[PDB]
Amino acid sequence: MSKTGTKITFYEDKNFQGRRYDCDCDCADFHTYLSRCNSIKVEGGTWAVYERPNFAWYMYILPQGEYPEYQRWMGLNDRLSSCRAVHLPSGGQYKIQIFEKGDFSGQMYETTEDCPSIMEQFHMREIHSCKVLEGVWIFYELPNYRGRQYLLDKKEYRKPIDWGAASPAVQSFRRIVE
Template sequence: MSKIFFYEDKNFQGRSYECDTDCSDMHPHFSRCNSIRVESGCWVLYERPNYSGFQYVLTRGEYPDYQRWMGYNDTIRSCRTISHPSGDSYRIQIYDRPDFQGQMMEFSDDRESLDESFQSRSIHSCNVMEGYWTFYEHPSYRGRQYFMPSGEYRKFSDWGAICATIGSFRYRPLIHFYEDINFGCRYHQCMGDCAAVTPSKWKVVTSWTMIPMIVFYEDNNFQGRSYECSNDCTDLHTYFSRCNSIRVESGCFMIYERPNYMGHQYYMKRGEYPEYQRWMGFSSTIRSCRTIPAYRGSYRLKIYEKADYGGHMMEFTDDCPCVSDRFHHRHVYSCNVMNGYWIFYEYPNHRGRQYFLKPGEYRRYRDWCATCAIVGSFRRVADY
C-alpha cells in the first residue's frame, strides 16, 4: 500500500495529513504544504484540484521543504498514486508536430538532454507504448514535470503542458526480484513497499535490482548533517556545504566536484566511504551527482589514437588495467562506446582522474570532459 504524509510547515512540523489513495481535492485537509514524507510507493502531486497545474513526481523519501521536490510554491491540491505497469520494457515515440506528424524518434531509456538526440526541444505529440515516463521542461530533469502513463497524446495540452518545450525525460524505475541468481528465471516487479516479497509458489528470491540510493555526510565517518538522494541532481550545494563521507546503499553513481556534472568525477559503487580519500577525492567538495542505469548486456568499446576516429583503432569488451600494454599508446583522442557504461582513468590500475562514458560517440577527448588525451586504464561499470 502506498502512503504519503503532508505537513503544513517545513521540517515535518505543523498540521499533517496522511493519505494512501488518490485525492482530487486536498484543500479540506490542509491549507498549505511545506514538507512531505513519502513512506511507500510513488506519487504525482498537483498544484491544483482535479490533477491539474504544476506536477511533481515523488519517490520514497523525505522532503523537508517544497524546493526539495522542485516545487514553485507551497500549494498542493490533489495527488494520485503511481501503480506499476504490467510489462518490463519501456518505449516511447515523440513527434515534433501534433497528431503524430513530422520527425519521429523512439526511445527506450532516459534522455538527460533531449536536443542532443532529437535535434528539437519541442514535442507536439507523443505515444507512450510501454511503461511510465516523466517529461521535464529543462535538461537534466529540471523545471516543470509531466507524468506520462501509457497512451496517445496528440497535442502537448493532453499531458497538461502549456507549451511544447521538453528538455529531458526519464522512465519510472521498478524494483525487480528474481528467483535465480544472475537475474534468471521468474521475477516480480515492484514500485514501492511489499509486505510479501516472495510471490506465490516461489521458494526463494536470490537476486534483485532496486532503485539507487546514496547518502552524503558533511563529516568523516558518517557524522554531521546528511542528505539522501536517489536521483540525478545538478546542484547539491543547497543540501550540504561539504562532503567528507558517503554511503552508497544501492546502485552506482557518478559524483562531481562542481555543479552541472562538471569538475573532477568519482565513480561510486555500493559500499561505505568514511572519508573522501576512499573515493580518491581531491577535496571534500561535491556539488552534483547522477545515477548510472543498471545494465546487464554486453560491453563494446572502440578507442582511437587520433581525433574523429582516425589512426590506430582497437576494440575492447572487457576491462583494461594498462592501456599502453594492449593499445601501445597512452593517448586516446576519440572513442565510440557501443554497449555498456565505462570509466576511463588517468593512470594504469584504475587510478587518477576518472571519466564516465555512456553509449555514444566521442570525437575528441574533450567530449568526455578530459583536459588531455591521456588514458592509463579503463573498466566496465558492472557493480550493480
Template sequence: LRKLHSYMFSIDRPSFDRDKIIFYEDRSFQGRHYECSTDCPEMQNHFSRCNSIRVDSGCWVAYEKPNYTGYQYMLHKGEYPDYQRWAGFNDCIRSCRMVPPYNGKYRMKIFERSDFTGQNLELNDDCPDLNERFHTRDISSANVMEGYWMLHEHPNYRGRQYFLRPGEYRRHSEWGSTTPTIGSLRRVKELN
C-alpha cells in the same frame, strides 16, 4: 480523446497497503498533516498549504491544483523537508495520484508536431538531453505504449515536470503543458 485520458485517470484501483504519502503544512514535517494512501483529486479541505512531504512508500505525483492540474511533482520514497526539495515553485499542493507499481518494459514515441506528425523518435530509456538526441526541444504529441514517463522542461531533468501514463497525447496541452518545449525525459521507476 481528451475524455479518454480523464476517464483513465479516474479509474479506482485497489489500494496497496504499502503505499503512503504524508503532507505537512509547515516545513520539517511540522503542523497539521494529512495521510494519503490512494489518489486524491481535492485536498484543500485537509490542509491550507504544503511545506513538507514524507513518502513512506510508493511513487506519487503531487499537483499544484485540484483534479490533477497545475505544476506536477514526482515524489519517490523519502523525506522532503521543504517544497524546494521536490522542485516546488510554491507551497501549494491540491491533488495527488499514486503511480501504480510497474516492472515491465518502457516504450514511447515522441513527435515534433501535434497529431503524431513531423519528426519522431521512439524511446525505451532515459534521455537527459532531448535536443542532443532528437535535434529539437519541441515535442507536441506522444504515444506512450509501455510504462510511465516523466517529461522535464529543461535538460538534465530540471524545470516543470509532466507525468505520462500509457496512452495517446495528441497535443502537449493533454499532458498539462502550455508550450511544446521539453528538454529531457525519463522512465518512472519506484526507488524503494
C-alpha cells in the same frame, strides 16, 4: 511488484511538523486538510501531486522516499493539493515514442531511457506527436531535470494538443523506477 498501495504525508511545516496529513488513497482534494507543503514523506510507491486542488494545475509527481524539507523535492511550488497515487512503470522498462511533426509526421524516435535534453539528444524542440505510454511518466519543461513536472497521461497521441499544452513546447523528460 507489491503495488499494494502508495502512502504519502504532508506537513504544514518542515521536519514533519504542523498540519501533518497522511493518506494512501487519492486525495484530489487533500488541500482542505493542508495549505502549505513544507515537509513531505512518501511511504509506499510514488505519489502524484497537482499544484491547485480540483484544478490539477502545474503538475508535479512526487517521487518515493522522505522529504523533511520542501527543498528535498525541489518543489516548483509549495502549493500541494490534488494528489493521485502513482505506481512506478513496471514491465518492459519505460518505453516512449517521440515524433517531430504532428500526425506521425517528421522525425520519429523510439527511446526507453531518461533524457536530459530531448533536443540535445533527439533535437526535438517540440514533440508534435507522442506514441506509447508506460505505467507512469513525468515531463520537464526544461532539460536537466528542470522546469515544472507533468504527469503522464498520453499514448499513441499524434497531435501535441493531446498532451494538454497548447503547443508541444518541451525540453527534456525523465522516467520512473523503483
